[PDB]
Amino acid sequence: KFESRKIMVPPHRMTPLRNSWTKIYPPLVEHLKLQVRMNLKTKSVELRTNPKFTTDPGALQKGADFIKAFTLGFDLDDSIALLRLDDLYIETFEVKDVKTLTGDHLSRAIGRIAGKDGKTKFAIENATRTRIVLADSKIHILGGFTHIRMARESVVSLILGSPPGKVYGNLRTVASRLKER
Template sequence: MGSVRLPKERIPIIIGKEGLTKKDLEHLGDVRILVDSVDGSVSIDQRGDALKANLAVNAIQAIARGFNPEIAKTLFDDYMQLIIIPLREFAKPGSRRIEEIKGRIIGRDGKTRKVIEDLTSTKISVYGDTVSIIGDYVSVQYSREAISMIIAGKKHRSVYQYLEKRVKEIKFRKIEETFG
């Protein structure tokens, strides 16, 4: 099916206590997961449904990008998705820009990330040189837009106002998505 490279510090999280996280992912995705703790690669062998196997790959990528396994497992719900935004695209090699962007997205004491998560009903992880978002299709789009605004240098207040104005719109679009 495929393989995913993991930062070595995330390998124990994929495996979980007594291998429970790995077993859960194998069961939910109907896959076999092989973890190479030396080079950090995770191989995923499809046993059944290809869609389920793809969702297992997404869940493993989410864990690799800093999400806890319980949040990553929500990707097995039909309406949930993972978006990974590479921050290297917004900074010159060797510059401190990536650290500045990460700091702005997280905010003082995690406030900015929390506000975006709360207003969009998403989960956000800032890990390595990436920002990752888990949520339903509609919410992820608004969360991504808010993060793009922060990356572009917009003031936090402007981002919060943008999201606060869109809360009703987000709810309406979710209902629209549900009932087609």
Template sequence: MRGIRKRDNVLSNKEGRVEKWVKVYAQLPFDNIEHFMSEFNSIKNDIETRLKIKLDIDRNNSLVTIEPISNETSPADMMKAKDVIQAISIGFSKEDIIDLLDEDSVLLIIDIKSKVGDSANHIKRVMGRIIGEDGRAKKTIEEITGTIIHVGNNMVGIIGDYDRAIIAQHGIDLLIEGKMHSTVYKRLESMMRDVRKRDLTSIWQKRDLK
């Protein structure tokens, strides 16, 4: 998976597996901890089983420790677990997290405050543009790109396969810059047509090789 290849090398041994002493840490959210714990506890066993890892929460230090439990645990499994913790922290639901566990799914995070500054009014305005009236802008971007988007706590999270998540991120960046919604949608639709053409070409090339 393209989004994690570089960080895989830091964790893996020569066989491409994680050394048993390796641990990865994820930060707990400082606010809305009760929501996090509720969602985390409801999916913890699924995460550990699917990713072959062990999760321990240290509430005193606001950390989640991720450890390998099998010789088959890969660096991708460890980093996927960290992404899952981040997704729960942002506010994604259990159902959304299940999608993130798919091998081809990635999590992208946009920090609104880092892009627009500390002004509460400006942040509120930008978040409103991303969500849209009755949630229509967010839903439209999700439908065009085939991704799952969560907006909250000055953050936007995107779950989807790499190409589609990047396109959704681009659309949200354009909205942050102040581009008109209709202009953004047209741009995303054009980018998605290119992705579908590339996917179709790849399928036919694989058939020709058989």
């Protein structure tokens, strides 16, 4: 009653894969009780199960979700939060899907979601229980629906070109009645 899933390894993250793989595999192999095989040539990771493992069918989907998380820039502490919780999910979205921007407009939108020393990114991870990774044209937010929904409202404020001060004011407003309840 085996089951194997196939997943793709990005080239931009295979060097931290071989850097921190020693911290990646033994928590899931010990606590979550799975089997991992590499294919370093064909950018593939084999996540396999066995009847000699524990019967837990949903943690195979969870393990494919950990490697899908690690596909898109995500560190290992968010993998610990994905180990412990279940309400935390993943999202991608595009810069062009809100507003048609080109070139330096795209660069200034990436600068607006990034900010000076990543401070508006810091303000959006700490006040919303979200975690932020910026790609070239992809935005990535983890978490639950009440958390990521106000993260949606903030990021479509910010990528529309609203100033970050109004983002901070609306951010602490939604954080205020977030921690109020």
